[PDB]
Amino acid sequence: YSLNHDQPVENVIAVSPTQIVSCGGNNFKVWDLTSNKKLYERGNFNKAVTCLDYVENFDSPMQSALIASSLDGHVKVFDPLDNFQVKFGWKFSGPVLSCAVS
Amino acid sequence: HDFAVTSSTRVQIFSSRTRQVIKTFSRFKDVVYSASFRSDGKLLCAGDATG
Amino acid sequence: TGTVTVILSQALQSNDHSLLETVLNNRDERVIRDTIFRLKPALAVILLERLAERIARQTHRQGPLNVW
Amino acid sequence: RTHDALLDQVKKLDLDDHPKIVKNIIKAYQPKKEKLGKFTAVLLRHIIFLSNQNYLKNVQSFKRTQNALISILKSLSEKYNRELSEECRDYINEMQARYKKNHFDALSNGDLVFFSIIGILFSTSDQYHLVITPALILMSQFLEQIKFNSLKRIAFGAVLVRIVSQYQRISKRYIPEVVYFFQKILLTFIVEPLDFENIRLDSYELGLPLDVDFTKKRSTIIPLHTLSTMDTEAHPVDQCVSVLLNVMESLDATISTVWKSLPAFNEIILPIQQLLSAYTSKYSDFEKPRNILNKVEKLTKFTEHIPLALQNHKPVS
Amino acid sequence: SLVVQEFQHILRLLNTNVDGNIKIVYALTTIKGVGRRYSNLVCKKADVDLHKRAGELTQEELERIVQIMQNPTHYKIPAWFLN
Amino acid sequence: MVLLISEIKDIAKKQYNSIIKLINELVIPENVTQLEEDETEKNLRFLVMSLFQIFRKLFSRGDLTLPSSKKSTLEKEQFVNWCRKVYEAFKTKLLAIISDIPFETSLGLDSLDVYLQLAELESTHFNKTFRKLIIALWSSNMGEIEDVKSSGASENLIIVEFTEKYYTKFADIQYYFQSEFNQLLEDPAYQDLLLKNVGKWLALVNHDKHCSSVDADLEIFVPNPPQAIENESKFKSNFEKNWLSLLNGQLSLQQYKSILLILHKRIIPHFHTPTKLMDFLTDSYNLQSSNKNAGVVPILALNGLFELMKRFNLEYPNFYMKLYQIINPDLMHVKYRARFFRLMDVFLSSTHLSAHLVASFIKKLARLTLESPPSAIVTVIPFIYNLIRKHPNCMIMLHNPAFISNPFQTPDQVANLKTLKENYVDPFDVHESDPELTHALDSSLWELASLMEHYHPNVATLAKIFAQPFKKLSYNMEDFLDWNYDSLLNAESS
């Protein structure tokens, strides 16, 4: 089956055992594949996004963290527990291309 | 404790407790595209620009 | 006429405190008027939320912000 | 025969109708190298000053004189090509300098007669030449760079396209500037708009209403270039539709000689197709647009219009 | 989603066709007239990374290498290392 | 004559009283200048120039002799009379430079030189003087200067020669130039005077050699500098305040194109608020009107806008969509297309573009090669070639493997190819604005086949390289970029 992301998707991220991330264009849409439809969407970014990763079950008060870099130095942390709502953000001056968490 | 970063015709594995260059793969011809580890932490793949 | 409107819209669509302070450094009342004229209403609502927030965070900033 | 002004004064002290016979006798005495070469120079300069000066005598009294001068130029050119080519090169330099000094105030119907004399005299179908190719790019710039805001420059461009249509009737090439000229002259005629703003025409003072009979006895080409392009400031509608039919006739002539062999003729003529369909939509009688539409529909059904084979090469040994 | 980055094929320095997909020390070796240790010393006096390829080494570094290699006695190169 | 006699008398010389009388004559020279505006002594102004030189010499002598440094007996009179005479002479020079609507070259040059010497001596024996003289010069105007429509901003005689021999040499006056115009823009009447004489500052600023230009150095006018190199940031503040006021007040079309060109090339290194110039450039690029002359500011607008994105990463939504919108035959016929295509190179050199984008751009430019002048053709053949070179995933749009036939196939496939070739249609739409949505991949370039059937030998040779296999990658667009009709004439003759 397909899930239409009109602007060019650049990263596919299997966060949950039931959910994925369309990480492309200015926004990013988090889908549930078991329901086969977008559970939430976040257009919280300036430039077209370029990176998104996920980390879970580690030494943190927030259990699940979602990092997303969007080509300005701007990496933003959301959380699927709070429906992918903004939790933090860093800005590095150079246009960020990649991001990774331990 | 380690992580690989793609670069100009080179993959650089850095450490974490030291954050220094541990390994430099430079046997390539052109710029590496992808760098991904295995599920067992020993074998990595590097997508290049030659196909 | 020399606004900062597109920059206000970009920053309030994608929050960055650095862009917020760098555009808040302005004080020229004609620029204030023309920006909030050619500014979106809901973007202005969340901007006024951010304004009350930054006034409370650093009350010393509220001098040029009392006219905004 | 040794100086331009001297030879011109001699011919004028004689008689401009019998100056042909006078110069012919002078050339005969000279032939009976340097003298004849200077004679060629001063005679081409004198006929160019004649074409600059007068057109008042009709085809029974002036054009026979001009063709006699053209034939003695033909003899001197079948005998001499070196000094002739040098003279045409110097004329290129002086006319480009005149262009630079005055964009339009320093152009000449004599220069038009010069370009036609070159196009009839020299080897027309050559690719590279010391005279043709600089004159070809000079005609190209002369067409493209003039500010089209008068019927005199419109007619200048029309007879320029006529000369290059002979050039590519024999040599069979293609001019995107002449395509742009067709679109520009058609938009300047039908500015009177919503569908064409990409042409960037100049002035909005001339146009085309529906008041023309365009009959068979209506004005055909019949170009009196020193008469029409000097008297068209008084502007009646018959001269306007005449010059419209002239640029259309040269368009269809260029079509039927080279543009049918041009592979891109469909998208070459697509703006001309939309333009002439608008012509027929607004005027609803025009037989030559109808026939040209018929010809281009025949060409768009006969043309392959398939992707090409540009990257089809034999394997190397 | 546009990303802008900061390469060259076979190139011309001191009238010699030098490949761009090779190491820089041995590229300055295949420059005619000069060899391995001289090339190494010129890259050292130009202060460049020897593990770079010749598609790297941007033009100001390249003209620095040319200036150093064409004025050798003026760049701390001894006369016994000179040819 | 009489002026020369008075000059000789003042030179030979109650000497102060005689000099005062001579200064009164040189101040009545203002009424003489009014008469010169009527008629410059049967159109010559030789006597006026002689009187001006005499006044300059007398001012030099007065500055060498009488001063107001020491005070004693009758010092008030003996110093203030000389000071007021110097002020009156400077005022006469200023008014002569100011009210001369008539083109008086010699008189205007005499006024400028007298003001120069007077400013030097005025510093050394007294910025305020500069206020007065720039007020005089900016009140000066003529019809040959106002509203230059073809090229340039203002063909002043007086103010332009004032810049070409007075402004671009001394950085100390340059700081006291920009620092005063802020005070002058705080004055309402003189602010209105500036906004009326908007082009005069453009003729002042097109000279590339401001104090912020660190590539070269400037000499010093006054032998004692009053802290002219205080802050480069404050110099840029004066520059940017004057420029924001000028761009907000009383613009026009030719001066808009000129200001935008100098804003791309010279102003940004001299500037301090790229966010203010960023919104100005968004207005300049999004300004879309039915005016055929105002419809072509997007070119250098997008140029400076891209410079601003490269300095700091802003955003312009639907960026290559607006590129596809603005690529026009008007760009083919304007003369900023060389620098616009340099911008097009650093635009399309991205590694995230795709087959649809490249097919749309190559196809639109193929239609423009079908209708474009030939110097533009030899400019834009490199773009088709090298852009097909950097993206080989679109190369099928030059030859189709299913449409090429060979004898070594089955007659079933021959009949299939025949019915598919009869089934083939052209699916490209020029009217669709989305280049990703334009189906330009299925359409080949019969227009490039026309370019193979061009008329010029060099253009035909370039298209024959296009027909030949693409063997190389570096094409040197800068060499194959800037050619003209006259340049092609000279090259074919050479």
Can you give keywords for this protein?
part of a larger assembly; 6 chains; A: 102 residues; mainly beta; four-stranded antiparallel beta sheet; 8 strands; 42% strand; globular; E: 83 residues; mainly alpha; Helicase, Ruva Protein, domain 3; two-stranded antiparallel sheet; 36% helix; 7% strand; elongated; ribosome; 90S pre-ribosome; 40S pre-ribosome; A1 cleavage; Dhr1
Layout of helices and strands, plus pairs?
The structure is cut from a larger assembly and holds two copies of chain A, one copy of chain C (68 residues), one copy of chain D (317 residues), one copy of chain E (83 residues) and one copy of chain F (494 residues).
Chain A: E1 9-13, E2 19-24, E3 28-32, E4 37-42, E5 51-56, E6 64-69, E7 74-78, E8 88-91
Antiparallel strand pairs in A: 1-2, 2-3, 3-4, 5-6, 6-7, 7-8
Chain D: H1 4-14, H2 19-29, H3 34-53, H4 63-79, H5 82-101, H6 109-121, H7 132-145, H8 151-170, H9 176-189, H10 225-231, H11 237-259, H12 265-283, H13 287-302
Helix pairs in contact in D: 1-3, 2-4, 3-4, 3-6, 5-7, 6-8, 7-8, 8-10, 8-11, 9-11, 9-12, 12-13
Chain F: H1 2-12, H2 15-27, H3 29-39, H4 46-65, H5 75-99, H6 105-125, H7 128-139, H8 158-167, H9 171-186, H10 188-196, H11 198-205, H12 232-248, H13 253-267, H14 274-286, H15 298-311, H16 319-326, H17 329-333, H18 337-348, H19 355-370, H20 374-390, H21 411-423, H22 446-452, H23 457-467, H24 485-493
Helix pairs in contact in F: 1-2, 1-4, 2-4, 2-5, 3-5, 4-5, 4-6, 5-6, 5-7, 6-8, 9-12, 10-11, 13-15, 14-15, 15-18, 18-20, 19-20, 19-22, 20-23, 22-23
